[PDB]
Design a binder for this molecule. Structure first.
Ligand SMILES: [Fe+2]
Ligand SMILES: [Fe+2]
Lengths: 279, 262
């Protein structure tokens, strides 16, 4: 397991991902940003917390509940640098798969050790040298420690052949992370969260991306149009509002024979040209 | 293996047996003449994107019991849910030359990983609007070529078997079946149109999120799932295409037909 600074060259990170199958990018995000995501999620769910004396929505997509998530986190250059080099040559485009809140409650037992691509039926056609089917970025809000259940990884196990037994608990390496660090988790890396034996939640959240030709865990078609229009064009494509280009330049997710973003009406020249009557 | 012409009332397991053995077949009178006429008229008034252009396509054709019976047995065991992939008008003008012989699943990067004994990546239903004759460019198939290993060379032009269809007949084209349109050496256009379906875990060629809400509410729940408006269930009870943790159709506010007090 490698812990690398934010300014590590991209080729070195992909090199380590190839060799060991995982790594941690310290200071992946500033503590400011990860805390803002948690704050915006709290403001969305609005769970009732009783005062000391007598005197709400269910959680949805992180891109819906958190403006910071859909405007800053999903534009993270480290996410797209790794995703472009991981899926690009084989699949062309990639897009957002799913993003979860990873809050470990005090007293929760150890998580089963698993690969994230296990629910892909086609993980049985893939060989360990092929590109991964998905990649997770797990960002710490609280500290990730041994006691509070920080994620454990088994380096090298991404090259294990298909059907290889799950790794042994003794050979699971805990990931120790400060707020803002991120654990890089390809879909083939064997991992699991540990037991939280402390009196406080282990907090954090994740993004994940996978090839454009695979159906994402989450749809974002229920999001209001005002949120979709404040997204960058890159994030609009990530969240399923734009046509995708395969490796062979065949298009999927099209609106008829044209692009989806054209049929839905999803400003550029007006901002650039001062003489545009909409500037 | 050979090309088979079977009637509408053929039992399903025979159709699947023929599909496994020969990789293709024709179901006669797949549509009646009314549907053949109605879809032609609706497209003309609008003039792919067939669900948007033809009310008969999205309300009746996409509910076709043969499509769902075949798709259930082809994709159900391995992937669970399936949904709409793409669909286009197949219009052949006089003088058009022969189409390159191809497999439809060729554009899936994961066709390289698949074995011929695995389930198909996609299936096409090519329905004739005009007659399909050998001289007007009727589709040609190569029965048994779906079982060739990947990277196998294309069939020779002489190994291709033309398909003959009256208006309303349908050719069933798994993604592994080598096929091509012929040259239209007649004086009248050869017309058809297609539906296609593929596993729920694969991204469709065509999105339908640009369709109007009132249009989507005309659809059946089944067709709503076909066209990307409902959460999909995998073979292993895992869900994809979900809204947060709930179903997409609940989050959009998409029983009511069964109970009159609803
Ligand atoms: Fe996981
Ligand atoms: Fe074709």
């Amino acid at each position: 397991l490698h812990y690398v600074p934010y300014d590590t060259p991209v080729e070195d990170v992909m090199r380590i991902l190839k060799e060991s199958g995982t790594l941690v990018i310290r200071n992946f995000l500033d503590q400011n940003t990860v805390q803002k995501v948690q704050d915006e999620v709290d403001d969305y769910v609005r769970n009732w917390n009783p005062g000391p004396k007598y005197n709400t929505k269910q959680p949805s997509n992180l891109s819906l509940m958190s403006k910071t998530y859909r405007c800053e986190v999903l534009n993270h250059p480290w996410m797209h640098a790794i995703c472009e080099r991981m899926f690009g040559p084989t699949y062309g485009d990639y897009w957002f798969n799913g993003g979860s809140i990873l809050h470990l409650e005090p007293g929760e037992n150890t998580q089963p050790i698993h690969q994230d691509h296990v629910f892909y039926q086609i993980s049985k056609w893939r060989r360990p040298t092929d590109p991964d089917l998905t990649i997770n970025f797990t960002m710490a809000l609280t500290e990730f420690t041994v006691e509070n259940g920080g994620t454990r990884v088994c380096p090298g196990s991404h090259l294990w052949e298909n059907g290889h037994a799950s790794p042994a608990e003794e050979d699971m390496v805990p990931v120790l992370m400060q707020p803002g660090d991120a654990l890089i988790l390809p879909g083939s890396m064997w991992h699991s969260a540990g037991a939280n034996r402390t009196s406080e939640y282990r907090r954090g959240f994740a993004t994940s991306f996978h090839p454009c030709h695979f159906t994402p865990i989450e749809s974002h078609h229920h999001l209001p149009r005002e949120m979709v229009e404040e997204m960058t064009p890159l994030v609009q494509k990530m969240l399923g509002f734009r046509t995708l280009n395969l490796h062979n330049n065949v298009k999927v997710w099209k609106a008829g024979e044209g692009n989806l973003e054209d049929a839905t009406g999803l400003a550029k020249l007006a901002a650039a040209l001062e003489h545009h009557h909409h500037h």
